[PDB]
Amino acid sequence: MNIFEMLRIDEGLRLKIYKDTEGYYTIGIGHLLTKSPDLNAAKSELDKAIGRNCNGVITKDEAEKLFNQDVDAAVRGILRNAKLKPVYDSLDAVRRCAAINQVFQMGETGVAGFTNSLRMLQQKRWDEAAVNLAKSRWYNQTPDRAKRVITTFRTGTWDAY
């Protein structure tokens, strides 16, 4: 296991525009296109992202290219966030994957509400952190995926995958 295999499990692969768990137009491996309800706006974002007129459909190679870009942007964003970087750098490699997964799903400006979880993780109080992480809209809206990510934070193993 690694971050690519982990997110591939959690996000799936679809080659035509679809709506994600929040109702937002998405393609590929969890590549969010727009929060706009206008499919034409999503199609324009897709064409801009791929560099050609896609008419709402991409290839597997194109999906994997967007995925590589999105994972890299997620990690770099963590490193450029003064609240997230110290916690991320304190973690082992498996738990770092759980952190990337969470930012990939919720956006770096969507983890803002996780101050107390972040402190418990940096303290390595793993069971307490796991309890705190589940007291969240994140967990309640996507409980089976959140349970996998939290088990990864709790144990530092890939047992949930």
Ligand SMILES: CCB1C=CC=CN1
């Ligand atoms: C909330 C995402 B996250 C970022 C760094 C460390 C742990 N989790």
Ligand SMILES: [Cl-]
């Ligand atoms: Cl709650």
